[PDB]
Amino acid sequence: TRNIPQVSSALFFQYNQAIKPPYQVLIDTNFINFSIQKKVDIVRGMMDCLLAKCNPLITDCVMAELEKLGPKYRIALKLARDPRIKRLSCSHKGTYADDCLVHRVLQHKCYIVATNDAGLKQRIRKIPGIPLMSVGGHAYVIEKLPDV
Amino acid sequence: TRSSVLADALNAINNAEKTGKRQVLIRPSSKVIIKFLQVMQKHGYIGEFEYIDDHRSGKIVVQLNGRLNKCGVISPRFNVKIGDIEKWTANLLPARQFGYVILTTSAGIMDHEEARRKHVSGKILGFVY
Amino acid sequence: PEEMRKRTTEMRLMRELMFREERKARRLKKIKSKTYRKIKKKELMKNRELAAVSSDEDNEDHDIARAKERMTLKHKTNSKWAKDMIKHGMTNDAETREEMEEMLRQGERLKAKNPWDLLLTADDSTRLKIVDFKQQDVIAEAFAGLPGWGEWA
Amino acid sequence: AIQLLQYLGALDNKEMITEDGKKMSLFPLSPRFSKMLLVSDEKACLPYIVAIVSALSVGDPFINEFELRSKFYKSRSQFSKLDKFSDVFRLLSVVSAMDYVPKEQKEIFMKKNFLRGKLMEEIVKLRKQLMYIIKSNTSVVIRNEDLKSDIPSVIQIKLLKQMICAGFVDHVAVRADVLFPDDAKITNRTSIINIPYIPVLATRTPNIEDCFVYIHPTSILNNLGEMPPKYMLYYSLHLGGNNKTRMNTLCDIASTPLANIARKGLLLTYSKPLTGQGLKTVNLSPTERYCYVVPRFGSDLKIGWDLNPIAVHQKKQKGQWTVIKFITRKGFQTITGEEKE
RNA sequence: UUUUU
Ligand SMILES: [Zn+2]
Numbered sequence: 001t002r003n004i005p006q007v008s009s010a011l012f013f014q015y016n017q018a019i020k021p022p023y024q025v026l027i028d029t030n031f032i033n034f035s036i037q038k039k040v041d042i043v044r045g046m047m048d049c050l051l052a053k054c055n056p057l058i059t060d061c062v063m064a065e066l067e068k069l070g071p072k073y074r075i076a077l078k079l080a081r082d083p084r085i086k087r088l089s090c091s092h093k094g095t096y097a098d099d100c101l102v103h104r105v106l107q108h109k110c111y112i113v114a115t116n117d118a119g120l121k122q123r124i125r126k127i128p129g130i131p132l133m134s135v136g137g138h139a140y141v142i143e144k145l146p147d148v
Numbered sequence: 149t150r151s152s153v154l155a156d157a158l159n160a161i162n163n164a165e166k167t168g169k170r171q172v173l174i175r176p177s178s179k180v181i182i183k184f185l186q187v188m189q190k191h192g193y194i195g196e197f198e199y200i201d202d203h204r205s206g207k208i209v210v211q212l213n214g215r216l217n218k219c220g221v222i223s224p225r226f227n228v229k230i231g232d233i234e235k236w237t238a239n240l241l242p243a244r245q246f247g248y249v250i251l252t253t254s255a256g257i258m259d260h261e262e263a264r265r266k267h268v269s270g271k272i273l274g275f276v277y
Numbered sequence: 278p279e280e281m282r283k284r285t286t287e288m289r290l291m292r293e294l295m296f297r298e299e300r301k302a303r304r305l306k307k308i309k310s311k312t313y314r315k316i317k318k319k320e321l322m323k324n325r326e327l328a329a330v331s332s333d334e335d336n337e338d339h340d341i342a343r344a345k346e347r348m349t350l351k352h353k354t355n356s357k358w359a360k361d362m363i364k365h366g367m368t369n370d371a372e373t374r375e376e377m378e379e380m381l382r383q384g385e386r387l388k389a390k391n392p393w394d395l396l397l398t399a400d401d402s403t404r405l406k407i408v409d410f411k412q413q414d415v416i417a418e419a420f421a422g423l424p425g426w427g428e429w430a
Numbered sequence: 431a432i433q434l435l436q437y438l439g440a441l442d443n444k445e446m447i448t449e450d451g452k453k454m455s456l457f458p459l460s461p462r463f464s465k466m467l468l469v470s471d472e473k474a475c476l477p478y479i480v481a482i483v484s485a486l487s488v489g490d491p492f493i494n495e496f497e498l499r500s501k502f503y504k505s506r507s508q509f510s511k512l513d514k515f516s517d518v519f520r521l522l523s524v525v526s527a528m529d530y531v532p533k534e535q536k537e538i539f540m541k542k543n544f545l546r547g548k549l550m551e552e553i554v555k556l557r558k559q560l561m562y563i564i565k566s567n568t569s570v571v572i573r574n575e576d577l578k579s580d581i582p583s584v585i586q587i588k589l590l591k592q593m594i595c596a597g598f599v600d601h602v603a604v605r606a607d608v609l610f611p612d613d614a615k616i617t618n619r620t621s622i623i624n625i626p627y628i629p630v631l632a633t634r635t636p637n638i639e640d641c642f643v644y645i646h647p648t649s650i651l652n653n654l655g656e657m658p659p660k661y662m663l664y665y666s667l668h669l670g671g672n673n674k675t676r677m678n679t680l681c682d683i684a685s686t687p688l689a690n691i692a693r694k695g696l697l698l699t700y701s702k703p704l705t706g707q708g709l710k711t712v713n714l715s716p717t718e719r720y721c722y723v724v725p726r727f728g729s730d731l732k733i734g735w736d737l738n739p740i741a742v743h744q745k746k747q748k749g750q751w752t753v754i755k756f757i758t759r760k761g762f763q764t765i766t767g768e769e770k771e
Numbered sequence: 772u773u774u775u776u
Contacts, residue, residue, distance in 0.1 A: 029348050036242045068344050075217055075242060076348075095340065096390065098347070117347060119388075290716040321706040328722065328739040330708045330759065391530035392581050393509075393523055396690045396756065397469065397592045405471035407453055407567040458776050 008129070010109040015146070016129035018109055021052035025133060026101055027085070028115030029065045032076040034135045043084055046114075049133070049140035050148065057111070060090040061100040098123075105130050112145070153178050155221040157208070158274065161194075165216050172212060176205035180273065183257040185210065187250055188219070188276055191259070217247075221274040225252070230269045233260055240275040247277025342387050352384025437600045437695055438465045456567065457560075459487050466597040467560070475586055476564065477579040478522055479593055484556040485521040486665070491549040492524075494648050498544070505543040510650050513587060515659050516681030517649060518594055525553060529578045591681050595691045598663050598680060602688065602727075603627040605660065606642055609735050613638050616657075623652045627662060627677065630697070632733040641733060643667060646676040661688065685738045689725040690756055697734075699726045700753060704739060712766050717746040720757065720765050 010018030025046065035042055046054035058080055066077050079085075090100060098120045105111050105127060113124050114133040124130050131145040142148060150156070157174040164172035174181070177199065185208070188194040197210035228236060228251060234244075237260060241247035248259035253270035263269060308314075325331055334342075346352065354363060359377060361367070368374045397403070424430045435441040438461050440451035447455075454464035463483045470479035485491070495502070509523035524543070528550060531539045540547045554577070562572050582590060595602075606614030606626040614626050626642035635641055645651050646668065651658050661684075664677035692698035703711045703721035711721040723742050728734015741757035757765070 029344075030350060033348065039238065039242060041243050065344050065348065068341055069348055073348065075246075079243065079246070117350065118353070287716070291713075294713060294716070317706075324704055324706065324722075324739055325708060328709070328759075391527050393512075393527040393530070394684065394687055395585055395589065396687060397472065397589060399469050399592075399596065399691065399694065403472060404453075404468060405476070405564065405568060407456065407564070409456070409567070 008109040011129045014128050016109050016131070019112070019129075019131060019145070020147070021050075022055055023050060023052055023112055023131075024055045024057060024110055025112035025114050026057050026059065026088075026104065027062060027080075028101065028113065028117065028120065029062050029076075029097055030116050031114045031135065032066075032079060033073075034116050036075060036079070038135060038138060040135060040139055042079065042082075045135070045140045046133070049142055050145065054112075056085045056114075057088050058085050059088040059097070059100055059104070061095050061097040063087070064095045065097050102127075112142070114140075150176075152221060152223055153205075154180055154184065154274070155223060157181050158184075158219050158221055161210070161212070161216065161219055165212055165214060168214075170212050172210055174208040174210065177208050178205065180252070180257065181208065184250060184273065187248075187257065187259055188216075191248060191276070193219070193276060217277050219274070219276040222272045225271040225273065228269055228272050230264075230267070233264065233269070236260075236272060241277055247275060249275050343390065346384060346387040352380055352387070354381075434600065435461055437697065438462070438597070439694065440465075443696075457563070459483065459560075462597040463487055464597075466593055467564075469596050470593055473583075473586055473589060475582070475590055475593065477561075477577075478526075478582055478586065478590055480557055480560045480564070481525040481579070482518055482522050482590075482594075484553045484560060485525050486518070487556065488549050488553050490521075491546040491553065492520075492648075493544040493546065496647075501542075502544060506650070508543075512582070513681065514650065514654060515662075516591070517679050518681045519587070519590075520650070525550075525557070526579055528554070529574070588687075591683060592687050592691060594663060594680050595683055595688065598665070599692060599695055599697055600631060601629070601664050601680075602683070603629045603643060603662050603664055603677060604735055605658065606638075608660070609733075610638055614642070621652075622654060622658055623647060625658060628733050629664070629667070629677070630728045630732075630734060634731050634733060643675040643677050644670075646678055649679050651679060659683075661685065686740055686756070688727065689737050689740055692725070692727055693753065693756075697727055697729065700724070700742070700751075701726060701736070703744075709739070710766065712762075712769060714769075719744045719751075720762060722762075723753075 008018075010016050023046075027042070032042075034040075035045065042056055043054065046056070063080060066073070066080050069076065088104075092100065092103070094100070098117065101113060101115070101120065102123050105113060105124060109129055112131045112133050113120075114135075115121060115124075116134050116136075121132060121134070124132050129144075131142055133140055133142050135141070153176055160172055160174050182199070185194060185197050189197070193216045195211040195213050197208055200207045200209065222236075222240070233249070233251075237244050237247075237249050240249060248261070250257060250259055250273045251263050251270055252273050253263050253266075253268040255266060255268045257273060258266075354360060354377070359380070362373055362377065368377055432441065432445065435451070436443070436445075438454075440448060440454050440461055442448055450465075450468060453468060454461055457464040457467065459467075463486065466479055466483055467476075470476045506520075509520045509527070512519040512523050524545065528536060528539065536550075537547070539545075540550065557577055558572050561576060562570060565572065604627060605616070606628050607616045609628060616625055623645050626639075626644055628641050629643055632641045643664075645658070659682035662677075662682055663680035665680055666678050668676045668678070670676045689698060701724035703719075703723060705711070709722040711719050713719045720741065720743055722739045724739050725737040726734065727737050741759060741762035743754040743757060744751040745754050746752075
């Protein structure tokens with residue numbers, strides 16, 4: 001049987017009419033450094049960037065990467081376990097975080113992706129209606145979220 | 149020459165933890181050093197430390213438990229107003245509730261949130277987180 | 278006894294040996310030519326690869342290595358050294374561009390995801406011991422057809 | 431002829447017959463085979479060598495494609511299961527397999543598998559005779575049951591490959607792209623049969639293409655589907671119809687086993703100790719050291735090449751560093767450990 | 772093509 005995946009009902013051409021405040025945002029592992037490195041707090045750099053209440057989300061795969069890092073990145077590990085950061089369970093064998101994040105956004109058009117990886121960012125860019133959050137300069141920046 | 153004994157002490161602590169040493173020796177001593185280490189102890193970052201007099205400035209031997217993610221001094225000791233404190237905490241700490249900025253205020257050496265609660269201000273000694 | 282003299286000669290030889298690498302190692306230090314060091318490395322890398330001195334990386338180790346590269350992004354042109362060369366036209370030159378390209382590929386390497394050696398001790402003890410001549414040589418005949426170290430030699 | 435026996439160890443550098451040479455002459459076979467049996471005593475590998483030795487002594491019982499489609503490869507596939515890089519083991523596969531065939535069914539098995547029968551009967555008879563001379567001279571009624579043998583172990587296979595080497599030390603060939611990559615450019619589209627090889631001890635010609643030799647059509651390697659091994663053993667060289675020299679491959683060999691075997695011959699030399707990170711001349715004493723060396727295998731007028739570096743033991747005999755023993759990587763890595771301790 | 776202990 002042939003498969004033609006149905007484009008999500010949350011999408012009108014290129015604008016997602018479903019993503020709305022309070023936003024749910026997936027945290028990428030590299031985001032934590034450029035947050036710590038820039039002295040930008042996770043919860044509120046998001047609020048300042050998006051001017052809304054933001055619910056950060058750490059999946060098992062991104063989490064699984066973090067402890068593998070080791071003592072050098074303990075600060076990143078502890079901030080990941082801040083109780084304000086909710087946890088997402090995963091039911092796929094692989095621990096590669098980039099693939100897991102790309103799948104979740106493919107599945108449901110309700111997440112913001114917080115990452116600075118060029119390769120991952122390009123993959124998310126191809127997927128329509130996925131707001132992409134990044135940290136540059138002094139604070140966070142959101143590109144595909146016109147409600148801003 | 150020796151300009152800031154406190155800086156040398158804190159640098160010794162950082163090297164000691166980084167190499168995984170459980171104990172480290174600090175020389176020379178100074179009242180500010182004992183107050184700083186007492187603040188660190190109260191926050192739990194550092195364990196027992198003992199003073200050794202020699203009829204000179206003295207020495208410290210401090211036990212270490214690996215809970216110290218970084219500790220440093222702020223030289224020169226800038227004057228800090230109550231309004232300026234949050235600026236310093238934002239600059240020197242990865243997150244405001246992760247770490248403490250230690251101020252020498254008119255009421256003594258003490259961490260920033262204690263200073264806010266007492267409504268006092270002064271100069272800045274350093275930071276620990 | 279005399280055995281101490283043998284011991285002294287033993288340390289003497291070792292002391293000779295240590296100096297020699299010291300002179301050689303000391304001289305090699307002063308030569309810091311990029312070409313000379315470049316050739317020495319490439320010979321060294323070949324020898325390691327051919328000899329398989331470096332242990333194979335388990336899948337977990339690759340994951341740890343890939344974890345660091347993603348988690349830092351240390352091998353892209355946003356680094357201080359690379360950015361300086363780009364913004365000032367230093368990478369138009371071929372050699373520096375190569376020094377950039379080797380870095381990028383190194384990062385990309387880390388980013389990658391009827392029923393029908395024990396070496397032979399072929400020494401003489403390993404042989405099958407088979408068991409079976411001068412008079413034949415007598416027939417073969419029937420065919421027909423240190424000195425001088427210290428004394429005069 | 432003289433040089434060949436010296437390589438085989440039959441004759442010394444003074445052309446005098448060695449003890450091995452005397453033992454070799456006791457056999458009715460060529461020196462190449464006699465050396466094979468001379469080292470076969472290990473790990474009950476003797477029957478396999480005797481089977482192979484008789485097979486190569488009599489010639490191929492196999493019928494080739496030119497002299498003759500699905501059935502042919504079906505028989506070929508059955509006997510190539512032991513190894514995918516050895517034509518020798520195919521002969522071992524067929525010869526040993528025939529011992530399990532009931533007497534009445536040998537002829538049917540023989541025709542079904544495109545096998546030259548008269549060669550096999552002579553093969554069977556010689557395996558008996560070689561099984562007789564061995565038992566008589568080492569201690570004798572020999573039965574057909576004594577010829578029956580089970581599948582070799584993987585260790586036996588690796589050991590057996592080194593048995594073929596000792597009798598064919600001088601018939602090793604290397605892929606040309608390794609030594610001379612500029613002249614021998616191998617692409618993923620290049621056929622295995624057209625991948626050039628260079629025999630050892632081959633005369634240096636002004637044009638190197640004249641020394642290239644290619645895989646014979648009859649080899650399983652032509653149907654291998656992947657890149658052929660690094661080094662290969664050949665039985666003989668034949669001039670193909672396209673003026674291209676073809677070798678009858680025997681089996682593949684790894685470099686380090688090759689060096690161990692050539693160590694006792696005149697075909698192996700050693701470079702100076704290597705230097706660098708990892709490779710360091712560990713010095714036990716003024717007359718002792720452990721170090722890595724590059725074995726240079728083959729005899730500048732001929733074609734020989736260098737092998738992979740190997741960890742070795744050195745002792746200073748009369749001032750010249752001589753190789754006592756080869757060392758594993760773990761053995762060397764430990765050794766540098768105790769001195770640091 | 773032959774052919775051998
Ligand atoms: Zn997952």
